[model samples]
Target chain A: LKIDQKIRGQMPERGWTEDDIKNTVSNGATGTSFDKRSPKKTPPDYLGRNDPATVYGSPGKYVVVNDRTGEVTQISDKTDPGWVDDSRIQWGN
Target chain B: KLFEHTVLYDSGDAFFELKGNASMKLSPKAAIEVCNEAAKKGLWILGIDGGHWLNPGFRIDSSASWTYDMPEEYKSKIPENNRLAIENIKDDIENGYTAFIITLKM
Candidate 1:
């Protein structure tokens, strides 16, 4: 994950720094982890942020695929009337 | 083509795939919904990834976005006492997500 530290200004002042707030916020919002998966990809950036297939355009729900397998899953509650269907949402083929 | 399915999810990430096939991208919320539905129908491990953090506070799941590391000038603003604070959070910042790569099997 590539984030601009300048944005840290937006974070609150608890024992947590701006990065902590960002990581926690991003983690909550996207369910992605910043921790590394392996030493080679140590510290995974939790890249779901800004994914053309997963971000802003679809403000409410999202989808993910297993790279090793072709299975697909829907991770949001589509039946909710309050759910916003953003044009940005992508349905992987 | 008949294929086996596998699913993976953690508080930080989730995904699904087919044995010797390709994978697809699904939203976290969507994945949960499907999981519930699958369970209702008695489908075991029906291609669902489920992982979540216990303490999310006020953070909303949709608020997630990518960001980069703080610039040097901003880093210098921290007092010596606070320098360590800055160091720890600097590493996890993200710019954006890369495309998921799907490999096909014969």
Candidate 2:
């Protein structure tokens, strides 16, 4: 239920609402994990970019989460393929 | 003059720009064509941040490293490492690599 503060600020401008986030979290399946390889902290994971994971709502929408802390780091709307297959990512929930 | 340092291109719904000693690898028309291809795939490359080139995922998706941006009010979510990579990208540009940027108008 927690969302990153900066990401929360960007919701309205990105044409997404709290309901969308809820739907994505409640019904969405997890995809690849976006790893920063941070020396200090574990990186966040992704929700629904490609197959295997549930593609909630429209295609461009996906949630970014910290698997360690369970914080919603971002709700990305880019139609970029990196969300699905970044080298640093390990695909799956 | 604000982006005088960068080359800019407009492709209707999108804008492509390059900066910091960078030149474009793809012509405006060619870049837009690639954008159309991406649209067909339901994908677009987001520069210096997300995309096959900027953030190439599991399958090692290949394409030109062009990027698109959302509207002004909604900023792209950039990770800390990706933000730092701007300098590296700029260094690449300085070394004669072209940096391509695509931004969506709507």
Candidate 3:
């Protein structure tokens, strides 16, 4: 019943409260905003390359495509340059 | 405005996998679309897996990290006259392309 309790807003050992879930679900979850301008609140970095020009110096390389207008506007890549490495482990077990 | 206890279910053979119940803040429709796209492309829809959790940011998982390291075989595949591989990957990632494993299957 732990899983059911979790789904029903019962706080387990580590679970969100009804208010916590409501706040998280309502006002949008805290942390990243995915906006290019907000450097502090973007998606996690995935790129591993270290060239400034290739990463930060570049612009418009990333674009957000609108499903309706078919208009594409360029945005920041937001991927970290130093994170790319051959020695890194892959996700998933 | 927000609604409470709104439960929606999708009945299908395909399912999204999330480890640790990581919370993603994307709009539900958009997140579903992303999951569908990942499924179509054979890419895993992973949650925030293990990574360096710094003060304000985090890194992607290891499989995601492998995108940076070009193998020797792939290196030879690059054109001799130019930095084609690096340019291509940069272009691809910037263009919202997902990482994938390419096999000859010969």
The prediction achieving the highest lDDT against the true structure is: 2
Q: Which stretches of candidate 2 lie over 4 Å from their true place?
A: A28-30, A37-58, A78-93, B1-106
Interface RMSD of 3: 18.0
How well does each candidate superpose onto the true structure, as a TM-score? 0.18, 0.37, 0.16
* Cand 3, B chain, TM: 0.23
lDDT of 1 by residue, A1-93 (tens): 322221222211112243543343354334321211222121124333222222211333333222223111122322222332322343332
C-alpha lDDT score of every prediction, in listed order: 0.25, 0.37, 0.24
If the candidates were sorted by their TM-score against the true structure, best first, what order would they fall in? 2, 1, 3
Residue A70 accuracy (lDDT) in model 1: 19
> What CAPRI class is candidate 2?
incorrect
Interface RMSD of each: 15.9, 11.9, 18.0
Each candidate's fnat, listed in order, reads: 0.05, 0.14, 0.01
| Candidate 3 segments exceeding 4 Å error | A1-13, A28-93, B1-48, B53-106
lDDT of 2: 0.37
Tens digit per residue, CA lDDT, model 3, B1-106: 0211111212111123321122222222323443444444444322211222232233332222111122334333233212322333244355443332111101
Q: After the best TM-score superposition of candidate 3, give how far the Cα of residue A22 lies from its true spot, in angstroms.
A: 1.8
**Candidate 1 ranges with C-alpha deviation above 4 Å:** A1-57, A65-74, A81-93, B1-43, B53-106
